[PDB]
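Risk mitigation, structural track. In case the binding assays with nicotinamide-adenine-dinucleotide fail to produce interpretable data, a predicted complex structure has been prepared as a fallback.
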Amino acid sequence: GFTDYKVADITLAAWGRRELIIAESEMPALMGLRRKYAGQQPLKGAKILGCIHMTIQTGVLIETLVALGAEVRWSSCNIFSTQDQAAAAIAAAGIPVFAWKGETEEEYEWCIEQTILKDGQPWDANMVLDDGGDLTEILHKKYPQMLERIHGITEETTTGVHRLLDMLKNGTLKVPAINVNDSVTKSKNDNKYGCRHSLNDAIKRGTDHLLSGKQALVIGYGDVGKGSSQSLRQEGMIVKVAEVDPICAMQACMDGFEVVSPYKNGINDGTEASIDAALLGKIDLIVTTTGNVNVCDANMLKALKKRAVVCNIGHFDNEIDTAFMRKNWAWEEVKPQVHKIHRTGKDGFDAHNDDYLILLAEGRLVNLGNATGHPSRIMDGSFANQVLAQIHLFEQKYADLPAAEKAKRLSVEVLPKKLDEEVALEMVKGFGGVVTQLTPKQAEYIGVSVEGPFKPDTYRY
Amino acid sequence: FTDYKVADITLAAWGRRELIIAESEMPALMGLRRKYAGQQPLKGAKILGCIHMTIQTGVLIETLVALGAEVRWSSCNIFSTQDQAAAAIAAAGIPVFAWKGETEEEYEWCIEQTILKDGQPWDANMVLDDGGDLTEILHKKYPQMLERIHGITEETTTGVHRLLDMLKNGTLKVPAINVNDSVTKSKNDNKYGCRHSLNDAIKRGTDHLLSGKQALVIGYGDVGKGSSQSLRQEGMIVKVAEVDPICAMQACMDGFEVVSPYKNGINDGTEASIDAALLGKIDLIVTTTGNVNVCDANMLKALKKRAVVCNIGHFDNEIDTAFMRKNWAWEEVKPQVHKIHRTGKDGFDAHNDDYLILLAEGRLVNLGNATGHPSRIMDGSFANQVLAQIHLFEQKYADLPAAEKAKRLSVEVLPKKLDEEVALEMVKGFGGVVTQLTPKQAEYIGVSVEGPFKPDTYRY
Amino acid sequence: FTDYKVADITLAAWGRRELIIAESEMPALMGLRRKYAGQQPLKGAKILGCIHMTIQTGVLIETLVALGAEVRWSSCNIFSTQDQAAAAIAAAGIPVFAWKGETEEEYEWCIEQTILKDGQPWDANMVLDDGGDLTEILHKKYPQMLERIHGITEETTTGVHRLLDMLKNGTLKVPAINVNDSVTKSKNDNKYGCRHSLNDAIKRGTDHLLSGKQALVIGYGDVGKGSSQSLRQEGMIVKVAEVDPICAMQACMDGFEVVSPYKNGINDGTEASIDAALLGKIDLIVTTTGNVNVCDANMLKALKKRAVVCNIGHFDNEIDTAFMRKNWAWEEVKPQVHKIHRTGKDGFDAHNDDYLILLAEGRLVNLGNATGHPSRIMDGSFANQVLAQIHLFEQKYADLPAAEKAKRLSVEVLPKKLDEEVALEMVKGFGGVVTQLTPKQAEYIGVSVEGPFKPDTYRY
Amino acid sequence: FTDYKVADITLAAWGRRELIIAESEMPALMGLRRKYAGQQPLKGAKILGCIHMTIQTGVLIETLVALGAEVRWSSCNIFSTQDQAAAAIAAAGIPVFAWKGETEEEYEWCIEQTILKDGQPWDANMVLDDGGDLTEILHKKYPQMLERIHGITEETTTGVHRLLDMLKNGTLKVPAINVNDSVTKSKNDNKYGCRHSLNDAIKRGTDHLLSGKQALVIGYGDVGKGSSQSLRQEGMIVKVAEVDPICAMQACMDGFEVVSPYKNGINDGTEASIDAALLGKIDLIVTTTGNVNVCDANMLKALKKRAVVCNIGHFDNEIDTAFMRKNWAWEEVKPQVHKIHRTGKDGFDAHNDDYLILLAEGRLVNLGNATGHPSRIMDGSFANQVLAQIHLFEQKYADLPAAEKAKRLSVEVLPKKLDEEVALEMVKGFGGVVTQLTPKQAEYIGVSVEGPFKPDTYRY
Ligand SMILES: NC(=O)c1ccc[n+]([C@@H]2O[C@H](COP(=O)([O-])OP(=O)(O)OC[C@H]3O[C@@H](n4cnc5c(N)ncnc54)[C@H](O)[C@@H]3O)[C@@H](O)[C@H]2O)c1
Ligand SMILES: NC(=O)c1ccc[n+]([C@@H]2O[C@H](COP(=O)([O-])OP(=O)(O)OC[C@H]3O[C@@H](n4cnc5c(N)ncnc54)[C@H](O)[C@@H]3O)[C@@H](O)[C@H]2O)c1
Ligand SMILES: NC(=O)c1ccc[n+]([C@@H]2O[C@H](COP(=O)([O-])OP(=O)(O)OC[C@H]3O[C@@H](n4cnc5c(N)ncnc54)[C@H](O)[C@@H]3O)[C@@H](O)[C@H]2O)c1
Ligand SMILES: NC(=O)c1ccc[n+]([C@@H]2O[C@H](COP(=O)([O-])OP(=O)(O)OC[C@H]3O[C@@H](n4cnc5c(N)ncnc54)[C@H](O)[C@@H]3O)[C@@H](O)[C@H]2O)c1
Ligand SMILES: Nc1ncnc2[nH]cnc12
Ligand SMILES: Nc1ncnc2[nH]cnc12
Ligand SMILES: Nc1ncnc2[nH]cnc12
Ligand SMILES: [Rb+]
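Fallback model:
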């Protein structure tokens, strides 16, 4: 009798369930939590609004939250990232989900609204799980009465955390949050190694281009840029890296990359004359990794080598000036999420034109748009942290605290290191790794407990 | 001029040649000489320095002097000095007491010669240390001297741990800067420096092929990460041991198998707990931990015949070399390379097959068997050292009123802005070009166009 | 009448879009289209082709046609066709009989539709093959057709072996060119193509993380070298098995541990000879040999639960899939991905932990679960194919008198000069610039300025 | 015993210590010493040897002697001898004439001391050469000695070229084995040896950081492949130049940019032909070609200030050092390391910034600035040398009548079966386990279970 969902094709559910069963075997930290906490039901009474890519990996997260006692209502945080078989399996399990691959922007917003509302009125939500901040923003702008009864937000990704910290600085954040991104077992796992796995994967699925021997430019060298650069260099690309942060640039040099700017002497003067046209005319592939705006701009797009591939793996598509391309150039769909963009003019194109770019996923995050995002065994870490964060904020019960106590608890915090380590141990055991136990003398010598935590909070790994 | 002791002053011209090359490899340090020449911010500084007396240290010393300081110098390891560097510094009229191959007694004597001038304590007012030995001597044996010292700038992970322990116990007498935890130090020197210099030292000592052979790296912190890469890039099959599951996770994702020398990771000190099958396949063991007895006697007994054993952590006690001296016969191959014959203590057969090769008697192998990190990496570390010396010297802690000293007695890192400035100089040295944010982009991500670019929480 | 059979003709426009992209990635092959357009060297050629019906093959087919040939085409594997490529070729008026997911009976029928036109033998005079199946069928079932065929151009290592066996036995009826052993084929396609496409296929089938996990690659020839790199570059811990000690030496030096599935390398046919400890740690096994039963039933029994099993050699009999069909229960995950439940033959528990994942039913995994090698690699192989077709067609073997045909049966390779010319075009496609020898330099090393640059003995 | 000339006989005990270690790293060569000691297959052989007098060569020499040979030895390069090795060999009663840092006159004198004993031709009957200098002297100056010599075993690519030129011209007087082209030589020593030893030598000479810097490798044959990897694995950004498009294709697919020093690759002798922008960004140039003047005067003028220049090909004429001696001022940094000041010929400013660093005066840098290839790599080369000596000595060419000599006067390689046997011992040295084919698998691929496993056409 269950009908409170909207997905592309419910008949994909059996396939999705087969893939979920495989994924559980790849997610020991998350499944460890499900086993440890199922008896105690720490999320009994939790009512979680979730907005994160509706993949098979997210499916295992959802069913872990449910197994621990939560009810949820779910949507994706990107128009192209849903795996339709995952969405179907979740709907078939009696869980409200509003998600499909290839949403319009209007549909995207509608799906988030369907999580917020049940039977035309605000749902009795008391927790939020977000990736990128779009749900968080809608709640603050449109549903402040619902935020009165929400105990916390657990935010997945670097861009979302930045948005939360801006709200906090402005005094507009209404409920506390956990920055899940900055667990080591998230940032230095998912953001880096996930993109190492999934960037080359997506480019191959979209284009089937040989990468070896060809020239790439990676814009950014944070966690995503590091992983992305390795994804390409391990395939034999000649990778150049751009950065605004000299410390990240130093890392790129030491890691064996040439550090370059798209602009002469690194200065964008707003004009085509500031573009290093010689550089860009040699680039076969450009990848944006920044979380910033317009880092592959119109003038860069004009200067790129004919037939270059352009993609973004940061959270939002505005890293690349796709609006310029929609206004000025002709788009030819190769296949879904792969477009040739003909630089010859706006209205039509010659089928045999040589002067085009290939854009993946319309500039949306390419790993999820053209492939399946990060693998289960990587997302295990991120999602174990999500579950721990949900437990922590739900147990703290912020919404029920008196005003004076709320004032002390209204913050954006990370999980304690001890929990980050516990996640990591389960990941290591999944690989068959064996951690050494400190002797009492060794523990004393370095000033730690034998069980951890092992590093000071200052440590950067 | 006679206020020095080095192996051979005639090596000075060679040392100077290598200093002139090193200056061209150290743009951040040379940039500081140009920037601060006029101000002379270290005029009146009298710096006790204790750090490996290499060519790179020579460029650091001469930068401090160019900025107005006087110094008195020693090495922080018995095997790390480059005798041509020490000679060039002595020839420049700078007091230095250092040679490659000191005894422990000579090591202590050399530190004492920095502390004393013309037979009595120098009027020192600053300290630059690597590992904490000088810091410890001043606190334990010369506490009066610390009354006049404005600060300590500490280079390395082990030294910082020692400082933080003193602060927690209330025994630290002057403020310190943790130079190690600049990003342009920890995530440059500790990691990439060991990547360059570990394989270098093993080749110079043994000339062993590394490709195709089995290594075990104990630890996967900064040093262990770099060391593991040093070996894997040469084609070794590297396994990694760790106590910290987060570091272990990184090792897995970086493509290493994570193993323990002990069955199920449980080290009860018995021979039975050793994974003998594992250790019997290992051709090379490298310790990287900063901890004690992480390559223990039972592990040494179980290693494959003819395995190489070395340490790249600060102190030799990572490896139970004392057990080896007490029980097994040492055959010097050449300086800093010993075959250790497991057949007994008193004599050996020249053709015995059952030996280990120990490098540098367990002392830090990069400096012992090679020349440590390259100039262009040490540029970052040492630019931070000079900035830290300037900051603490200008603060003049010793002369502050009591209430202000209480607020300033701390162990701090340099500001991120300065870490970034050092990094920019390093990048420019490679010919790298950093992009400048537009005003709209800087607003979008919430930073100034000039930086800093990341919040203090950022881990890189 | 539609003289083709494809899955879905409406995919033609998509195929054509991808052909146009592929032409831009295949400069050697497109260069041949332009160079030989005027001459029409294949005018009058009627080519039976049997090779994976991919986008890359489509560019090859259209090159042959552009040079004057007519063709009739089928795939050489039941899972390797890209339906959009087949559709684009059919839509262009070229007879093609190919779809992804053929049965064995359909596979044979498709080859027969190339051989027969309108119910009788086509007047074929050339053969292009990959693996020998079309060659075998012609010799077995249509020997009279071979009286009119000038030659065979064979793509792959296994096909060449089959030809050489026929030649030794006196059963080969027409001469052949071994296209596999051009350097721009064997040391390009076989190696780098598998480097690109093996990890690709595993990701598409399973989306498994590879980093940190254990692989066993059986073989270290060209395919095995490329396959091992495909996995090691992703961060797998790769072990390699080999029978050839020279290839095993290369694996060691390349940084791999060389191991056998069998104790001391000796297979006794029983479970007692299996190294169960080794196989119980393997997450992924890949066969690369061109041999038979190199991942046998006893190995399959001993593999770690939930290991992935795949083959990238030409034929599925590298793995004992017959044993698995007879004894274990198969659960389709999605097309070309099966969980094989080791609990028994008749049914399975949906939540069983004791299964293996088999890709492409053991058929070549790169083509079965992905799209095979990329266009820019296939450019080299297919340029060689075109050149080989030109050469044998021009030689006109079928028109020789009977006594001379007997004398002219051989299996030859293309000259090194042509291998170099193909390589130059490939290099230019990367933007690479080859240096020209001066006359003095050419004299010094004993070559012509134009090449060839190496003696025929050279191994690259 | 006095029939020797070395730098310092007192280094002998050190050399012997290192020989004992090297024996443990050379299982193929030691396996041959054990296998053939009883039979004494080189009893009566009198071998003139000319090859780098290293510890590795010492193990080779002592193997030949252990199998019954007498020898008289010299080095094939002025900088390649390890003086402790030479001393250990002389102390063993073996005639050796070699030291590190010979003049060219001393080099020639040392070869002559091998040829002559007590002022008259020795009764030589075999030749072991690396590079052909000894071979050339015998043919030009001592043709009567060649009448009684059974063969030459030639180590390296350049020497083989010289032999093949003699054969083509009809001037080769005795047969030869091309030891270079064993797989366990060419695709071991030439490639992996340079991978190990190139970065080693650059670090020992300069201690420069390599990571992040730009290199240009001239050539991409076996030595250039290994050299490129030596630098790329350290994090250099490596560009490759080639004249052979097949090798260039390999470089592209291996992840390198292929560039020419010259515009459009045309080396017309003009300054304007140099790609000034390219050469002005290069920090390190390495020549690997075996050709002449591949790092020419105009390239040297255009290089980035403070670039390192070195050669790893056999002869120094790869680089135009003569132009540098004629035009620029040389400042010795330390032995085998010179700064070459581009400011003029007569003097230099000690602080000039416009210099290059040349290693080993352009002579092969691995041996000149380090210790050449490691023992476990040289094991393969030298096992092949021993086998080749046995083969030619047993064939007894000198004793054949003129008509029979004509049939055997050739340059040949060892049989593949022997190449495989060498490789097996190398793999066992790593602990590798090769799988044994079942009889059915051997039949399926058409080989004997024991090998050989590949046809003679196979390129590995
Ligand atoms: N696709 C995925 O699956 C995935 C995974 C994790 C995070 N993300 C997203 O990827 C983005 C990056 O995340 P991160 O964790 O790497 O952030 P980060 O802050 O670690 O790195 C971003 C980097 O971009 C650099 N940068 C900013 N503006 C630049 C410019 N104009 N030119 C060059 N470099 C510039 C910064 O200096 C910084 O080092 C965010 O939007 C994050 O939410 C996506
Ligand atoms: N040789 C050099 O030039 C050089 C360079 C920099 C630092 N250092 C020294 O190297 C040492 C390591 O420094 P670091 O910055 O990498 O420190 P770190 O704290 O980053 O790393 C040390 C690692 O050792 C691990 N560890 C501790 N006990 C262990 C055990 N019993 N088994 C396995 N792993 C264990 C820890 O979990 C930790 O991750 C320190 O002594 C430091 O001063 C040496
Ligand atoms: N999937 C693809 O796209 C693709 C590409 C090229 C070739 N191929 C096919 O791949 C196969 C291998 O081709 P290749 O060119 O690498 O051949 P190869 O002869 O170079 O290599 C095969 C290797 O297998 C080894 N081997 C044989 N039996 C073995 C055993 N029992 N255990 C371990 N090692 C064993 C051999 O010693 C040899 O080195 C052939 O079937 C070929 O036709 C496939
Ligand atoms: N230092 C060592 O220990 C060592 C080891 C083995 C061989 N060698 C020597 O190294 C040299 C190279 O040997 P190899 O086995 O690699 O030979 P090779 O024939 O395999 O490779 C030499 C390469 O140089 C290229 N080349 C020639 N002229 C060129 C030019 N003007 N510009 C660019 N590329 C050019 C050729 O095309 C060829 O591919 C020989 O002198 C050999 O005797 C030295
Ligand atoms: N070269 C060097 N000089 C000084 N301290 C160092 N620490 C590591 N390498 C060093
Ligand atoms: N893409 C491809 N097309 C045709 N044959 C192939 N063999 C391997 N990959 C191939
Ligand atoms: N170590 C070595 N000994 C002799 N010949 C060599 N050629 C290269 N390295 C060598
Ligand atoms: Rb150094």
